[PDB]
Amino acid sequence: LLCGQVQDEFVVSPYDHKYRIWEAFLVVLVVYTAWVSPFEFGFLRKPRPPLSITDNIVNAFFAIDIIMTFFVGYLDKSTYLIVDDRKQIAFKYLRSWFLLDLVSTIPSEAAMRISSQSYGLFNMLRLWRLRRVGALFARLEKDRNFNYFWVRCAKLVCVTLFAVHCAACFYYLIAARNSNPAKTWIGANVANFLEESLWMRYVTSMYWSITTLTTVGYGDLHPVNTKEMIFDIFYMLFNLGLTAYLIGNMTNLVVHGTSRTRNFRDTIQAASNFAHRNHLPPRLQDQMLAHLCLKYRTDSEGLQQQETLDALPKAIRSSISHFLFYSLMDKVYLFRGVSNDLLFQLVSEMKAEYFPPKEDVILQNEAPTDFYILVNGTADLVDVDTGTESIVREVKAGDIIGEIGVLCYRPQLFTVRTKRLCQLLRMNRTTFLNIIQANVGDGTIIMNNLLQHLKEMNDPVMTNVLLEIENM
Amino acid sequence: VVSPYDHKYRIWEAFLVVLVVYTAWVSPFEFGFLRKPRPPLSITDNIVNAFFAIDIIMTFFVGYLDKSTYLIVDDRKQIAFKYLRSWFLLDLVSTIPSEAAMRISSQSYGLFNMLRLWRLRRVGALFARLEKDRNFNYFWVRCAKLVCVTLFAVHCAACFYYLIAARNSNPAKTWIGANVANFLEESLWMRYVTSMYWSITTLTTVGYGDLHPVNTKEMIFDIFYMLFNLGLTAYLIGNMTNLVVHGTSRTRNFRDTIQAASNFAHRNHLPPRLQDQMLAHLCLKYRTDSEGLQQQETLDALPKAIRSSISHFLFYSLMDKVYLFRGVSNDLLFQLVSEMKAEYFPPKEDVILQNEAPTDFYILVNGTADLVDVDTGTESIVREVKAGDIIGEIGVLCYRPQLFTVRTKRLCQLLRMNRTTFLNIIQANVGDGTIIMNNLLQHLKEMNDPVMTNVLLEIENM
Amino acid sequence: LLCGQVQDEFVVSPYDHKYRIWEAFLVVLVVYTAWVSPFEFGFLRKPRPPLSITDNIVNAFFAIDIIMTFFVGYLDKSTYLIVDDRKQIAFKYLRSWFLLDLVSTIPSEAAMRISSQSYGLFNMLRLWRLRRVGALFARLEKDRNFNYFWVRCAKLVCVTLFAVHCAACFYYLIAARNSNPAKTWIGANVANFLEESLWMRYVTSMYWSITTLTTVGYGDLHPVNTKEMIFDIFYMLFNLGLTAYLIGNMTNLVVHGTSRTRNFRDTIQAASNFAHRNHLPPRLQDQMLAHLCLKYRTDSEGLQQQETLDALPKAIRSSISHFLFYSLMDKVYLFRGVSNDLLFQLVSEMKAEYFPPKEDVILQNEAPTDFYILVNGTADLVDVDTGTESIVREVKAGDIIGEIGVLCYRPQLFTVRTKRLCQLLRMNRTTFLNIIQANVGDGTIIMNNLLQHLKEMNDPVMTNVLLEIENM
Amino acid sequence: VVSPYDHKYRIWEAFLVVLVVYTAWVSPFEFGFLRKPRPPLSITDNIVNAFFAIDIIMTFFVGYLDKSTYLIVDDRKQIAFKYLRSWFLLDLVSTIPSEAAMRISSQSYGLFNMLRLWRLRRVGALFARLEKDRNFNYFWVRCAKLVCVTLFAVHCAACFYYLIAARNSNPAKTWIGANVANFLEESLWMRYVTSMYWSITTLTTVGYGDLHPVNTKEMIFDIFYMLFNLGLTAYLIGNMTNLVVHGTSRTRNFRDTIQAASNFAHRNHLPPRLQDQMLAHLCLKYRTDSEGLQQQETLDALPKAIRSSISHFLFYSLMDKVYLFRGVSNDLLFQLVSEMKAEYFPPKEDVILQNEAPTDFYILVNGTADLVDVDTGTESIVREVKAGDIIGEIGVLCYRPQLFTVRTKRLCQLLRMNRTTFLNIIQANVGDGTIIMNNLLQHLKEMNDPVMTNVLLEIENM
Ligand SMILES: [K+]
Ligand SMILES: [K+]
Ligand SMILES: [K+]
């Protein structure tokens, strides 16, 4: 019960802290300009002081960014190194985006000087600064410290808010830039717009955009002339896909999060209900559920370890195995006095594994393929040669399992049952023979083996007698 | 001192849940539609506050479970000094009677009454507990939680929107003032119904057209309300999709399993005499729920040792009743029962053919079978075999083609043990082989059926 | 290319035909009454001739069904047999549903005779006949001949249509049963209802119900008084969940249908793009994609066969194996002259398998565990003992593979490579020894083996020479 | 006779696609808004009809692919007798000019012009072909097909609804007559725009309120229209959900793989010196797309024989350039290259440590590495090793602790050969061991680095 509950539960680097803390500051300005540019494009025809001053400030900041970005190295994809070549940095920045960044920094006063018909379509050029938020969202998605669900939710919220704002600004622009204002969507409802506060018109247009996007459609503020009808047709066509995309993303976030818990939940629910019904055992039913809980943990760790390995080079896997098991392997009785390099080679190919309690790692009278070594827990040696399952000896962490059968090429002697959650490490017979063959120190192993057979009475002696007869 | 899980405390929590629901409904209503204590309701508010005061004084005497506690921590400190440091002040400010707050200030009625919403932690904890239960489905309580939060959102939005309408001078030029002439001179029931109708119309994205925002404050509120509505609707649709996907997998799995089996049968061009039988067996396996496939899907995941004990416990009383195993041993029977395979057979099917090669002998557990013998086109019934009886054992022990065809009558569950495995086990324990042989010999005493068998064997028995 | 395209591409039984063709006929009457009862409950207060006559006819038909169902046996869940016991049939029908079926058959004239205030709520009792459509849908879902997608779509369509009809009838009933008709949802729009055609009122109410369900909400025909507001509140509250359920079902039908296409699609897309890029081979890249196509077919069939088997009793699996392989194994050279029963026992435990072309079923110098037999295709015998991969002999369908190593308990002789899609069947060494031990016919096998060693020159002879000294 | 896949025929089909789109747009428009041939458009209709007549007379000369055909069937019969028996009559009735149908009857203009919609089989076949392509995504063409059918449904509904409005006497008391005073006395453009606006408003479930059905015919049509709309919206949402689910699995897989690796590293309490390296390796392997993980995910699924030939072809020119293998053999090199493991290393890392146990020697394929030697805290660069060169071979062949630390400069791909495997391979072919040894000995002639090694080995070489 307790276990089951637990289971359920002067250039600069592009990575400097002083540069990352400043690049992220430009996201605030990107948000500000993304809000301002459609509002200025729709509701304003001439630069007003309280907005023009801030626009000039932001343009100066982005010009500072442009003049600074020439001193920032990048990471080559074919080298994974900082380029640190001012010749290459400039010829990459110019080819990637330099004129687009430049045109998005000219103050609106200069645009008006060129032509008064401008300053509407010129402010929309400042939307080019929206690549920074996309790059930031990509980095956040490819980052571990930030939750995927909240990142996706924030991205969706930003997208829908920007769409609402842009649509509202465009639709109010269509309303205002029209003779006979009484024949417009807002002129047929208020009948006195272009005279009251800008805040009222902004909130009215935003309310219309929100009602149209969420498909509420109250009925006030509806298109009258043909241009508004066409724009609203296209807007609703976009909104259908936008809502479908939002629903799909929400479904995707809702699923695959609790999905991998449900396999465990139902595979244990079947066991629990089968135990509860059909002559419920007193305590055996409690034993089996703990075994299932341990197995679900064992295979997951046995798979995560297998997944993270076999994808790394041998040079680092060998180092990891040496860090984990070389110290423990020094206590192995067979490898006593052998050359030190052979120990390293053996450790580098040990293939650690895990086993649930009451599991038969080796069964009696089987083909000799592998020999095991204990790391954690303990196991009991049993044999059915006498007709009964009686234990012979208990092996603790630090002894070999079934080494007699593999060395002498004969079927195993005793069935090994792990009375506890045991971590083992097994290496094949063919690999052992290959390693021994490409070496000169191998007599010590057989001397240690034969010495060990003497310490056990009459169980190995028959095998020892056979080996002595077979050696001659 | 009392411990959790007690039937005098869980019932008390379940009773406090309905009071929490009452508070969650009432507090926004008094915040929006009410100004004075309104004795029609302040007495009930005081009653609920007294009940929650009883709870807050009672909670000092209840234990809890820590990360590694022994299922209970029954002391004064470490529970009094834990509760006071988590939410004591919030649970105390949210139970002060509204009558007292009037003396402090007369304009804080609704604002102070909205503090009672802190009691929703009870509902949150209940939903969290039901999420990790066994008798209740997971997605079916997730959807209930979504429905509850949707209803709460609708009620809160309606109350806030009517508050915005009422707290504005010149009641005309408002969402309710433009439709209803003088709403302020009408019953509270109809105004509440109208506000709730508007809230539901906005939430379900119907938007009939009546009761729409007029001034800027209502538009500003409604924009955020609609954004929250879109988010909530998307989340609810996702949860419903997950519930549907994970709530009908059994039928799809059965369908695709049967389709794959039929494709396999067709690929090798098996005769229909086999296809019908395998289809019937598979339909029986995937139709009997919690007994047919459950036993296999459970015992398969055991490491041949725990399931051995399971079969020993589940098949010992029936095993000891057979005549073949009378006085063999108390561990040989353990090995025997651990070396059996459980099988099921649909009715009107034969498990043993007459004059077949003797390879298996069965032990009946449930149901009945008829020992059908044929002389010349006559399926004369010899006798009926009941539960807890052995069949087909005389052909495998005494090597000979099978005597009688065993056709099943009802839905039966059989235990099958291989001849080779039984011979290997018997050869390993020769001492019980004599017991088995004499038990078989003494049983062969019925009318003229095995009489020649004893004599024929005695020819080679010297 | 071609292979890849192919891979992508007087009682009666309750099962009598004359009874199934009549029970399905009652579904038409169930649909008719499911349409009529809400319409009669809302739009009609007294039994009109053209509807009362048909209602009496349908009631007579259902009374005939009631009086006939006493002569139909059922299938017991604990027996899976037709009960055929008229004593038990009646005591099951009465306990399950007899009074509910009876009350849903009384003609409406009798209900009016009891009280004129009735005949509204009495017609809604006829909705009890909706269990038949539910049972039919369950049977269709549990049936193979009918597509799951279309059954689910039809069920959803029926549910939503019934909801629309019931809501429309209830809402028109609320409108009509009210004094001062000018203060109703339909009285404020038409202002002359209760006087024009019933068809107009029915279609108007249905149009309102459809507009409310699909969340269009044009604006005409909206609630006015409090009762209509409450009913509409509850109706839209139900509609939200109904639409969520429909969307969830549609998503579930859309996914899991093309899902198991995409694993193959992307696992072959990766291979195709890797072959196209990075020094595309002339024809080797064509060879590997065919191997992947064959493997995707091989493991699928190898899994479907494994899934359908191991779930059936041994008595039928043995019969299937005997039908498939007993005739073929008669040609096996080792089992010539052995007792016939031993052949049956061997056939019962052969565990047939499949292998893609250019696959090594047995590799040289491995532990002797299994020996194989060919069924289809052919394989080539290769050995690296000479330092090169040179074929020695080609084995056709009907010969054993690696039988020398398993019998003599020595490492295998030659690596076996399947030059074509080969179906094999392998059985273990321990099983073979157990089968041989529980028998008396075994000398024939070893004599046949030794005779076979003489037909091959100097390759088995060294092993045969060792065996001659090993036997002594 | 011409065969499919020809660039003079596929282009022709792609050009007919836009004509099919034009017909699909125009035919409902003329059915609804038009009565007479309207020469402003009948000339274009006749042009398109002539083009489709050219196509229908041309299709007698194009082959096809059957179930087991040899990619083409170029005859007169079995293609003429197949096309004439499948859709010849439909493709001929759907190309008769509308001028001819006027003589038959003047009231069948729109009904006969609606028969041109049969040409949508071209778009259907195009979408089916694009579904089973390689350069185009599957869900991204499914969504395009859904968008196209949604647009077609909107257009058809708008045309039908305006036809219903116009074909009714007393134009007032209609959905457009109640809003627009005299719609029949206004331009076709504005009427079409209004009808399309109503159709889009109904489809997106906005329902502003203007242009609503008045009489019973419009209500009856609109009920079925809304039901179809609900079905189409549900299907489109399902398809979009499937696209989203199957379009972002790569990022989730990378995230969960990195999370699992970090959990494994933390569980065993590895030092950071290993955690950073393994995280860098995993990020590099999951970041390099189409070259890093693609090679492993491809070669892993090969049965050790085809991938052997792949490595033989991909690693023979570079292998033959090494000084160690000059005149060794033409099959031993095949075995060696088939017995190599491909590995990748991020820059600024060391693959061989100085004075380590000699166990592997590498062959560089791409990138550069620096042979770093340290005397006393001085990482003096000895020399740079380029692509197609062997490293660390002097320590494994001549058993000795490694001489120089090989630190990588760029992103490199290496081939690793195990000392034990190489020794076993060499021992199997002794005649080439002499060649390998003398090739090694002759190379040992640089300045003072291996001079003592040659002498020291010659001490034991007698
Ligand atoms: K809507
Ligand atoms: K709406
Ligand atoms: K509306």
Residue numbers in the entry:
A (entry chain C), C (entry chain A): 6 to 14, 48 to 510
B (entry chain B), D (entry chain D): 49 to 510
Text lifted from the article:
The voltage-gated potassium channel AKT1 is responsible for primary K+ uptake in Arabidopsis roots. AKT1 is functionally activated through phosphorylation and negatively regulated by a potassium channel α-subunit AtKC1. AKT1 is the first characterized hyperpolarization-activated voltage-dependent K+ channel in Arabidopsis thaliana, which belongs to the Shaker K+ channel family. Each subunit can be divided into four parts: the transmembrane segments comprising S1–S6 and the pore loop; the C-linker which contains the helices A’B’C’D’; and the CNBD.
In total, 181,714 particles were used for auto-refinement, yielding a final reconstruction of AKT1 map at an overall resolution of 3.4 Å. The model of 3D classification displayed a 2-fold but not 4-fold symmetric assembly at the cytoplasmic domain (CPD). Two pairs of diagonal subunits sharing the same conformation are named as Mol I/I’ and Mol II/II’. The pore domain of AKT1 displays a closed inner gate, with its narrowest constriction formed by I285. In Mol I/I’, the helices B’ and C’ of these two C-linkers are pushed into a relatively “straight” helix. By contrast, the helices B’ and C’ from C-linkers of Mol II and II’ exhibit a “kinked” conformation. In our study, loops1/1’ stack against “straight” C-linkers of AKT1 and might affect the downward movement of S4. The two “straight” C-linkers may sterically restrict the conformational change of the neighboring C-linkers, thus inhibiting the opening of the pore. These structural findings may underlie the low-activity of AKT1 in the basal state. In addition, four phospholipids are built surrounding the pore helices of AKT1.
